[PDB]
Amino acid sequence: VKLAGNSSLCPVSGWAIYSKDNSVRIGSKGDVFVIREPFISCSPLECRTFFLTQGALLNDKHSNGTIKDRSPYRTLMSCPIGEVPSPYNSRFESVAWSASACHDGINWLTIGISGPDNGAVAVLKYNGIITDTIKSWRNNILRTQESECACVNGSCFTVMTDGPSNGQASYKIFRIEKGKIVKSVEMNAPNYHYEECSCYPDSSEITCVCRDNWHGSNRPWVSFNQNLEYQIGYICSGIFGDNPRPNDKTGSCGPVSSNGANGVKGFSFKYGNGVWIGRTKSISSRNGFEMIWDPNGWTGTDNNFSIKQDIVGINEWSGYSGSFVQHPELTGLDCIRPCFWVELIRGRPKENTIWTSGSSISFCGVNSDTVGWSWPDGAELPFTIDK
Amino acid sequence: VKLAGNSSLCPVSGWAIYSKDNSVRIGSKGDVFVIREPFISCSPLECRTFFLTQGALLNDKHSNGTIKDRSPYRTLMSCPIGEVPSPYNSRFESVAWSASACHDGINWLTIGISGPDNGAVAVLKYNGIITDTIKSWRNNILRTQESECACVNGSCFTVMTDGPSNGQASYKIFRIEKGKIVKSVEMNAPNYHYEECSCYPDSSEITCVCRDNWHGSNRPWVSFNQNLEYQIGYICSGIFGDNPRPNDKTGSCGPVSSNGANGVKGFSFKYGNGVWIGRTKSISSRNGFEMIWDPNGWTGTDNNFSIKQDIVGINEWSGYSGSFVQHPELTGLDCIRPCFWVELIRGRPKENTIWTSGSSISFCGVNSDTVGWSWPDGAELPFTIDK
Amino acid sequence: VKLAGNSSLCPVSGWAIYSKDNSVRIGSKGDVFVIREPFISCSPLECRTFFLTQGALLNDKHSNGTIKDRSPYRTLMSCPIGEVPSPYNSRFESVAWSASACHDGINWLTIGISGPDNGAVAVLKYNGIITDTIKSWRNNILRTQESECACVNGSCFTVMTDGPSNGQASYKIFRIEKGKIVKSVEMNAPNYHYEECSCYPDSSEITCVCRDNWHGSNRPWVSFNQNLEYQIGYICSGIFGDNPRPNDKTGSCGPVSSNGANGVKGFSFKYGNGVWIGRTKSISSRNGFEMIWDPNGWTGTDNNFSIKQDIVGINEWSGYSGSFVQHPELTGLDCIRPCFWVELIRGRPKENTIWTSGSSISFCGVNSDTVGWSWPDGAELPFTIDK
Amino acid sequence: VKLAGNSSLCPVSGWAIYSKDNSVRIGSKGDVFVIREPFISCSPLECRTFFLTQGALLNDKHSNGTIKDRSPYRTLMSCPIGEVPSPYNSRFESVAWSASACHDGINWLTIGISGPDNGAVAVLKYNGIITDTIKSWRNNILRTQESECACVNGSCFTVMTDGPSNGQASYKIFRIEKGKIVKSVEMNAPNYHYEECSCYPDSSEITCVCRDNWHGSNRPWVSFNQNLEYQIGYICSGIFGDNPRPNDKTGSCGPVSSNGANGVKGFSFKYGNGVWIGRTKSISSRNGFEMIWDPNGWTGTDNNFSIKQDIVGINEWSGYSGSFVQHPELTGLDCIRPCFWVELIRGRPKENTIWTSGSSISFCGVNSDTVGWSWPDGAELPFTIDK
Ligand SMILES: CC(=O)N[C@H]1[C@H]([C@H](O)[C@H](O)CO)OC(C(=O)O)=C[C@@H]1NC(=N)N
Ligand SMILES: CC(=O)N[C@H]1[C@H]([C@H](O)[C@H](O)CO)OC(C(=O)O)=C[C@@H]1NC(=N)N
Ligand SMILES: CC(=O)N[C@H]1[C@H]([C@H](O)[C@H](O)CO)OC(C(=O)O)=C[C@@H]1NC(=N)N
Ligand SMILES: CC(=O)N[C@H]1[C@H]([C@H](O)[C@H](O)CO)OC(C(=O)O)=C[C@@H]1NC(=N)N
Ligand SMILES: *[C@@H]1O[C@H](CO)[C@@H](O)[C@H](O)[C@H]1NC(C)=O
Ligand SMILES: *[C@@H]1O[C@H](CO)[C@@H](O)[C@H](O)[C@H]1NC(C)=O
Ligand SMILES: *[C@@H]1O[C@H](CO)[C@@H](O)[C@H](O)[C@H]1NC(C)=O
Ligand SMILES: *[C@@H]1O[C@H](CO)[C@@H](O)[C@H](O)[C@H]1NC(C)=O
Ligand SMILES: *[C@@H]1O[C@H](CO)[C@@H](O)[C@H](O)[C@H]1NC(C)=O
Ligand SMILES: *[C@@H]1O[C@H](CO)[C@@H](O)[C@H](O)[C@H]1NC(C)=O
Ligand SMILES: *[C@@H]1O[C@H](CO)[C@@H](O)[C@H](O)[C@H]1NC(C)=O
Ligand SMILES: *[C@@H]1O[C@H](CO)[C@@H](O)[C@H](O)[C@H]1NC(C)=O
Ligand SMILES: [Ca+2]
Ligand SMILES: [Ca+2]
Ligand SMILES: [Ca+2]
Ligand SMILES: [Ca+2]
Ligand SMILES: [Ca+2]
């Protein structure tokens, strides 16, 4: 039965651990896909991990040069949450080097993007049957969330970007029903840069927090209702949420240009003026991960904050992070539950290997007791294939 | 419920990618089967890849000599589409060095041929229970589709061949109900040659686009109704569909004698006088893949066409291709949906290995935007076991 | 719903091939159990392979010594017919160095004998739950069918043997209901020897063909009814069933003493005074396999016969062989369908390895065309673990 | 339906072997989790083995140092009884270096503890959804059963411990409904020590037999009803159940201090004044396992017993052990069947390897015959990774 999507977000005081797959540790001996850009999505029955394979296994030669982002071998697959991504336990979803997925309560919708950099095509599938396509309109790397899309009342919403990664690009919001694109809209957003949006449903409204690769080290947000009427802004908190970023100082309601180029995929959950900010501990590279509660972070520009929970220690490897939710239909609760995941990138460029891959951890928001710790990857690199 | 088969083949403008298994790249380290002759068939609930294994895993010594077509070791097996053929995720079907399979909407029918070239016998299983057999009637390598068979309203149809591959052979058309051969017609087709027929339902009638190993570098076709009343012909288009073949020029409505000896198994979708042709990019070897829409190719003999979509690059290994459909029962559509797959042959006789295996890719037709690319095998040869 | 057991054996002219797993070949790389004593039994829904693992993998140090018949590491496991027996696809049944299994149409019954040679205990499970045991009554290797028990009207029947192999031992029949033993009878068989019976239902009565390891080169048989009233004898046919055996001569209704010591597990199907005989092709060793129809060979001492179908050629390894049946409730037929499996033993003591394991092929009785051939194991010995 | 747990515990005279996984043997070559602390729990439909992985595989470098008790890499996982703990056959439960699990008849409840030693948080999942948490209240290694919690009429019960391992600590009992902690009680147990309780239901009440790591060589117990009203004491039998322990002699209803320090997880079944004691055969180290019937052991301090049964030999490594039950809803009996499992520890600290892992065996109480034997782990150490 379809997901109502009309409840508010559970107010949550801390983050309890939900999963860890240990993929790279196990992959040293096991048959584990080289993957990256992993994410989690839940259905009214199960929660799955979705990932982009590199069409190759760990500690094998075809993991050579897998730092590369796009190829015709990359595919989106999924497995149950907490299990290593394996040829022997993973469902095939689509051929993709950029992807999103979610479940309307009835069926899985997956969006996979493959093809040339200047002509990429997005394949929408509803219950594994192709239902639509969307072709690149700016002819410069069509790309999407690498996180769950968001479903409200039988409709599913996503953001896509085409254009430069180092200047003004174009951003469309899609509304999908049964894998059919039924409405789209181009955000008129001069000086904003949106990428890899982390989008969640909250009171029949979608909110997305994204990646400014052009010139923002804080995150841009876009929010919109079912009719794709949208609002936009930047998270005003001087506790910056991108990577790279400056040391915390007074923030902006626009893109903080200082250390704003490049970035990483991230998320934040909005509660009124308050915001839960997921972020790396290191300001210069993908190490560490922490969760911060700033009661005025969404719209205030100061950097004072209340709560910090540690998730990955400063000296340990992190990467992408995304939001995922559990709906009352699955949870039984009166509200939609905030969760987040963290990719733990290993290999190139930071380590001396011929390959890049990641594992994952995940957390769900609660009001009961919670603890900070460090849950890093744990693999001893380099592996045998590097010698 | 059983598949109606009564609707018309969906009009398609371009092909969107559906699956890529990366079977060979992953076979480097993983436990994957040496396979060839893969193909895809759907039930109303799921789509599956079928394949003949060589009863052997990749990068093991038992892949030695796997260029050989027939042995008592080959078994027909299947796994969910897009996944790698591994003995951990594969379902056993039959013992076979030539096969066919299809689902009538109720249960899977499979046909596996094994035994000596002198008098091989086909075994028919319905829900995995032997339900009929048929023995060679010319004592010269009884062989069938290596493709999905077609089903319309409870009856399933396939095409078998017995006899020379380099001259006149015998051709039988079968009607199969619940696993039992209930009718067969011997085809009166002197100077026609049919092997490895790709067959699909289209308005309660079946169309087969097959291979002429004898003396045609265009493709033989046979249409028939439920009572196995048939019409035979050849694809008239000057965009010759076989491999090997001559350069494109004036077509013929009989077999195109030039470079007609030998062949690859292939497919085509008929649309009035038009034809959607899928073929190799090279005219001399199993390399490259492309779809061509010839608006008059079924009946006309020019080599003119209106659309070309690139599937596999010219310089990269391809091989077999075959048709498959997705019925309204599976899709919700009011038409039978045309799809296809391409086997990607690796190793012998073209490459310096001790083995021959294949990976697969597949596409389904749409009217929405699409793009041509190259989605090749990707593995680096030779492997550890060749060295 | 219960297996009826009330219908007759299907008359069958020949044997169509049904499964081939390629276990030892695949085991050269893939993670495959070293097993032996495999056998097939079918529920009214699926057919499974039961095997006795040695609790080790192929090509690993622990396969060392696997010629050993008994140990505390041997477990009875289960996998889908034709698939390779591995930790990744097999189901745990019982701890066992001698076993039996059969489905009554409601649930699986399993019988797993383990423990010391001088006081073994058979554990009976019904639907995975233990439901009875029985202690050795002769304190010399309590041992049983190594092949499917036969079921009629909700009761399941088996034969077990306890005592010496070099002479006269003791033999009991059992009627098991819901995994409870409800009746047991000791066969009064002075000068008969019974081991590893292949038992099949047929017109509500059980017929077992067994193994004389003591002094009989033709095969002993017990027939009984639902009340365990029984008749015994030997297969009269001059076509000697057991191996080792003499060359074919005139036979006897009692134990043929010429080459009567030792033996191999085997099977045969009775049809009136006729008999279908499955046996090795060699008279000295476990090589070859062939099926033979002697229309009077059940009661007639003549060495004539009218059908010989090749299964495994004389120069190839074979070994154990048993009967398995398929009931109407699974096939929709109007009778009980005979089928058999052959185990293909590789390694010690005939081949220079540190291990003994085996693969399996199976056939089912049909009335349409069949051919004979050779379907051997086909692995190249010795393995890496032997070098 | 939800388990009643109102029947009494089925009285038994011996223990028949139920399952053996052969983990470390299979792990030599195959992809098997480095684990420890395994336990069995059962739903009304199936039986599963839970285990605490070390986020690594046997015979891989990542198993290095796996003698450490707690780490971020440790996760609670489960698989079907008797299958090896594999990335390919095993399910993710939660992240845990301490755990319990049980099934109320409707859904699996899991508890996983992770975090710092001074801050560990127990996360509770019901059907894989986080439903509660409980944090360390004494800041000293929060820990739980390492076996199945017991279930009664929709409520599940567990015991937890926080505090010193070598002195007075804090013990608490919990009532869990659908994953919600509904009631908890702190035991007033001065001069007692509780850890790793084995808890079973018996006539709508809960009996836990535990471990005194402080100063007790016999095991403590705590019985309680659904309302969390409890009585406490120590197993009075002079046949001591802990390890290390001193020589069997006269017992005590309080802490027997000789060798009292330290211990090993165990179990025992109460039968009026009678006790079924499971214990290692060595008094100094985890070697061997035996079952012993002391008809007055619960309340009488003499060291006489009626039955002893050999499980694992003295010259073989044992390890942990615990109870598990098979409710009438699963077996069909009218009592709650007692069953136990034994962890067979291999590697450090007792052997020359870099790793530690455990295999397992299980037994079920019967009334029919059994046999004493020795089903030891059977692996040949060291492995290649230790060389
Ligand atoms: C489509 C694509 O390649 N997206 C990139 C992403 C991208 O380059 C930046 O956002 C710039 O626009 O960089 C990130 C990254 O790790 O920084 C990897 C992504 N990899 C893939 N999704 N495969
Ligand atoms: C039964 C059989 O061996 N069919 C052959 C096929 C055939 O020989 C030609 O069509 C000539 O008749 O050639 C093709 C081929 O790749 O050319 C491989 C097929 N291999 C398998 N189907 N196994
Ligand atoms: C219980 C037992 O050990 N059965 C033996 C069997 C036996 O030796 C003969 O029947 C003689 O008594 O021979 C066969 C055999 O290979 O000849 C192996 C069996 N091995 C196993 N089933 N484990
Ligand atoms: C939570 C924890 O660390 N538990 C320890 C346990 C513990 O040290 C003792 O009970 C005393 O406090 O000892 C046992 C043990 O081997 O004796 C291993 C346990 N390993 C795991 N549970 N992970
Ligand atoms: C939300 O959706 C439910 C289910 O359709 C509906 O009954 C209810 O009216 C809505 N309640 C709110 C405002 O959350
Ligand atoms: C990876 O690639 C480079 C060239 O692209 C090559 O030099 C190197 O040997 C490769 N590594 C492996 C192990 O294949
Ligand atoms: C949900 O879906 C239907 C689709 O027609 C729509 O009409 C209705 O307004 C929606 N109800 C809500 C917002 O709960
Ligand atoms: C064939 O197609 C028509 C139109 O879709 C449908 O109404 C009819 O039920 C089908 N016929 C049969 C016999 O199933
Ligand atoms: C395969 O067999 C060939 C002979 O055809 C032999 O030359 C080669 O060494 C073999 N390769 C392997 C690794 O088995
Ligand atoms: C097998 O057994 C023998 C005798 O114990 C031993 O010496 C040999 O090395 C073993 N082979 C293995 C374990 O590879
Ligand atoms: C256990 O509970 C069930 C349901 O209330 C009941 O039918 C049964 O008799 C009970 N047994 C007792 C009370 O011992
Ligand atoms: C395990 O631990 C020690 C210390 O890290 C190291 O010296 C040793 O080489 C390791 N062993 C392996 C094979 O990883
Ligand atoms: Ca940035
Ligand atoms: Ca040709
Ligand atoms: Ca004999
Ligand atoms: Ca005769
Ligand atoms: Ca103690």
Numbering used by the authors:
A (entry chain C), B (entry chain B), C (entry chain A), D (entry chain D): 83 to 469
Authors' text:
Stimulated by the first neuraminidase (NA) crystal structures, the NAIs were designed to interact with the active site of all NA types. We identified a novel isoleucine to arginine change at position 223 (I223R) in the NA of a virus isolated from an immune suppressed child on prolonged oseltamivir and zanamivir therapy. Our results support this suggestion by indicating that a ligand-free form of the pandemic neuraminidase adopts an open conformation. Together with this structure we present the structures of the I223R mutant neuraminidase in complex with oseltamivir and zanamivir to investigate the resistance mechanism of the I223R mutant neuraminidase.
Crystals of wild type and mutant neuraminidases were grown in the absence or presence of the oseltamivir and zanamivir neuraminidase inhibitors. Instead of the hydrophobic pentoxyl substituent present in oseltamivir, zanamivir possesses the same polar glycerol substituent as sialic acid. Consequently, binding of zanamivir to the active site of neuraminidase does not require the reorientation of the side chain of E277. In the case of the wild type neuraminidase, the glycerol moiety of zanamivir forms two hydrogen bonds with E277.
